[PDB]
Every structure is written in C-alpha cells, then in structure tokens.
Specification:
homodimer; alpha+beta; NADH Oxidase; 13% strand; globular; binds NADPH dihydro-nicotinamide-adenine-dinucleotide phosphate; binds flavin mononucleotide; oxidoreductase; nitroreductase; dimeric; nfnb protein
Chain lengths: 223, 222
Amino acid sequence: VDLAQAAERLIKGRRAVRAFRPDEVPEETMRAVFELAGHAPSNSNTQPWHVEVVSGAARDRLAEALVTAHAEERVTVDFPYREGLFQGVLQERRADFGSRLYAALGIARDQTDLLQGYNTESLRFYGAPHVAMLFAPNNTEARIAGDMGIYAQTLMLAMTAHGIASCPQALLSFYADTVRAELGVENRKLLMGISFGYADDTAAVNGVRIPRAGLSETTRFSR
Amino acid sequence: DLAQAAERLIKGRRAVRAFRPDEVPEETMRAVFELAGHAPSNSNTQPWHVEVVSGAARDRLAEALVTAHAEERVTVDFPYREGLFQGVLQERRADFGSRLYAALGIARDQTDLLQGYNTESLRFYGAPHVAMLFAPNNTEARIAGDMGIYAQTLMLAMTAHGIASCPQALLSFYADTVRAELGVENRKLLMGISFGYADDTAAVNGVRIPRAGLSETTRFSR
Ligand SMILES: NC(=O)C1=CN([C@@H]2O[C@H](COP(=O)(O)OP(=O)(O)OC[C@H]3O[C@@H](n4cnc5c(N)ncnc54)[C@H](OP(=O)(O)O)[C@@H]3O)[C@@H](O)[C@H]2O)C=CC1
Ligand SMILES: Cc1cc2nc3c(=O)[nH]c(=O)nc-3n(C[C@H](O)[C@H](O)[C@H](O)COP(=O)(O)O)c2cc1C
Ligand SMILES: Cc1cc2nc3c(=O)[nH]c(=O)nc-3n(C[C@H](O)[C@H](O)[C@H](O)COP(=O)(O)O)c2cc1C
C-alpha cells in the first residue's frame, strides 16, 4: 500500500454512516485506534480532548437516557448558537445535504412522525455498539475547538483504516448533562459524540453520496 | 496494509520548523488541496476558505509580517489570553516548550535569540509555501471544530506526498496584515500552515514531541 494511495482511500473512504450492524469492535482494535488518534497535533501539544468511550450495558443505558431526555425536552447544550451561523453558500450546502439525506431515507419534510422515528434512532447511535463522547475544557473557545476537530478527524481516519464506520454527531452534545450524569463526568463541556462500529451496507441511508464544493469554491493559489 | 499506512501518516506527520527551498510541484499541490476538501463538516457546510501563497507573493507576505511584528502591530481575530490553559494542559504546554527551546538552543533569558527565532517563524521557517486558513466572520466553537477537521485532513494529505508542514497560530496574530496583502475581506484568520520539504540537517527537525498516555486522555466503560 503506497502512502499517497492510502491517504486517498482513508480520506475519501470515511463517510457519515447512519445504520450499523450490532457486532462489537474487538477491545485490542479499539485500543490501537484510540492510541493512534492521540497523535493528533494541538496548540502547544495541550491535547485538550477527554474521550469517553461507551460500550455494552453502559451504552444501552446511555441510549435510553438520551431518548428519555429528548422526549422530556431536557436540552442541556454546552455550546450556544450564534446568529447568522449559516448564510449564503453555507445555507445552500445545508439545504442540499438535508434534501439528499431525506431522499435516501425515503422521508418528505412534512412527515413529522417519520422524522421523529429517524431521530429517536439517531439518539440510539444508529444501532452502533460503541460511542465516543468528545469532552473539552470548560473555557473552550475557537482555538481549543479547532484542536478538538483535529483530534476528531484523526480518530475517524484511524477508525476507517481498521474498517470501522463512524458518524460524527453534534446531536449527542444537545443532551450534555445526561451524558455527564450517566458517565460520572464533571467540569467538562461536550462538543460532539461519534457513533462507531461496522456499517450495515444494505441500509439505503448508507448509499447517500454527499458532494464537496471543489477547488474553485474553497481554494486560491497565488504567486 | 491500510492499518500500517494510517500509523505511518498519523505518526509520521510532525511540526517541521526548517525547510529546503524546493517548491511542491503544481499538480501535487492541486491534488493535496482537492483531497483536503473531502473533510466532513456540520451539515456539509465546508466553512473553510484557503489562501495558498508561493513565490514573490509569499516573499512580500513574509516581509509584511516581519514589519508588522517589528512595529508591534498585533491584530487578532480569535483571542489567545494568558491563562487559557490551566492544570495538566498548562504543564503539557510548558513540557513542549522545554523540548522545543532545548532543540533550538535558546534559554529563557535570551530575548535577542527569541526575537530572531520569532522573525524566522514569520518567514514561514523558510518554507516555499504557506496556506492561510480563513473562517467565517461569525465563527464560534462548532465552526472552528470543522476548521480543525479540515486542517488535519490537509496535513495528512501533505504527509502522504512527503510534504512537511507546520501549523502556526502565530500567523493569526497579524490577521489585518495577511488580509491586506491577500485582498481578503470579511473572513477571520484562524491559523496558517507553512509547507514544503523538510531540511533533515536542521536540529529543530530532530525534536520528537510525546503525547499523554491513552490512560490519560481516554476512558473506556461498559
Ligand atoms: N499576544 C500575542 O502576540 C500572542 C502570541 N502568541 C504566539 O503564538 C504562538 C503560540 O504561543 P504559545 O502557545 O504560548 O507557545 P510559545 O512557544 O510562546 O510558549 C510555549 C511554552 O514554552 C515556554 N517557553 C518560552 N520560551 C522558553 C524557553 N526559552 N525555554 C523553555 N520554555 C520556554 C512558554 O512559557 P511562557 O508562559 O513563559 O510563554 C510556554 O510554557 C507563538 O508563536 C507565540 O509567540 C501566543 C499568544 C499571544
Ligand atoms: C462536527 C460534526 C457534527 C456533525 N453532526 C451530525 C449530526 O448530529 N447528525 C448527523 O446525521 N450527521 C452529523 N454530521 C455528519 C455530516 O452531516 C457529514 O459529515 C456531511 O454531510 C458530509 O458527509 P460525509 O461525512 O458522508 O462525507 C456531523 C459532522 C461533523 C464534522
Ligand atoms: C492549531 C495549531 C497551532 C499551532 N501553532 C504553532 C505555532 O504558532 N508555532 C509553532 O512552532 N508550532 C505551532 N503548533 C505546532 C505544535 O506545537 C505541535 O503540533 C505540538 O507540539 C505537537 O508536536 P508535533 O506536531 O511535532 O507532533 C501549532 C499546532 C496546531 C495544531
């Protein structure tokens, strides 16, 4: 395996997977993956990430607690929304993603109950046997959050290298107090959760193909 | 196999602080930046705007940064206040600094040497190219997280083609200077990434920065 070919395979191969088989990732493989992810760089080598990996009965209790919190409207998000977050082309991209996702699920925007069933399953980690909750310092701002993203991508690519599918989910961070209470975590903010395991390649949702903007839209070269 | 190749990329990438003058071939640069675009993001928003600078334009930019620093014209879009890092995070920062400054041969009391080192850092460590990572005006934690996803995708794509890199928060302390030299408006500068081919004869490139143990950053429960 040539390095240039390997990076293309990992980077393009990793996709947000929304339906998993129940089979667990072997403990030795999970150890190798999370050890490798720790090699992510960060400002001054601060490594601000605190990662809680949940499996088995603890993962089942956590899924049920999230479903209950969602039903009781107990939203406890650590990161507030900022006005005008997605305007212009950012809004166009979100709308296009939403349309492709709902078309792959076979759901129309007006089918409120079907959107509910789908979102209940999202809180059950899309059936994934494992979830990694990415906690960050209480004073996390843009620079620290950037490092949390560097880590998240290092982890997802290390998972892809071992045939482990993943879904990064901001949704899980909307019930941060529930995650903290279940896991006994104190004085840390929850940025996202990453559901992981082995993809169910028969699920239509895993056939969704999300495009990218391309060089003309993202990059400029000057000399 | 793929598992070994991922280990080689993730562990092989290091912050390189001395470069050869040789340029990255244009076709390789286009392939690397197109591959980096495959980074995921919230709702596929892809909030990144990247300015890649080379040749005479890179020289003019480096000299403008050197001048801004010498004149104390610091302009920051994202604050970096002292005390941002506490407890173990502060000790990891101090431990890194002790390792870096020992490799550079610069003591804590050497103001003239620290100034000379910072001048070279604003000259992108002699790298033939620099990528300036611009983010939306209203960037907060979630959007910044996506910028980080992109930055790591880009650095690993570079490593795969034997391209060395150094992410630099330092360059974001002269945001108005970078904006003016590049004709950029209404975007915030998060960081710069200097890149090219490592000068393997430089002592600074021999530094190996460790990581906290898996037991220190990760907790498994069932
Ligand atoms: N307002 C501004 O202009 C700011 C600029 N920056 C820049 O952004 C980058 C990031 O800064 P930072 O993350 O602090 O990294 P720095 O390299 O500045 O400092 C990293 C660590 O090394 C220590 N250190 C500094 N000099 C020595 C030495 N000779 N021997 C041993 N240890 C040493 C620092 O202590 P100490 O606490 O004494 O610095 C700190 O613990 C740098 O280029 C910095 O100059 C960062 C923040 C604010
Ligand atoms: C930080 C972050 C948070 C995300 N949050 C969610 C989420 O809550 N639910 C979800 O279904 N997908 C979520 N996504 C996944 C995407 O929507 C996806 O990465 C994007 O559409 C690009 O598609 P791809 O990853 O399949 O290439 C998130 C992605 C990231 C990077
Ligand atoms: C977002 C970010 C900003 C950084 N800023 C600087 C910088 O301004 N100057 C510098 O010499 N190194 C900078 N670093 C590089 C590191 O300090 C380095 O990644 C860390 O010490 C781990 O070492 P390694 O990348 O060689 O494995 C930065 C790293 C990141 C991820």
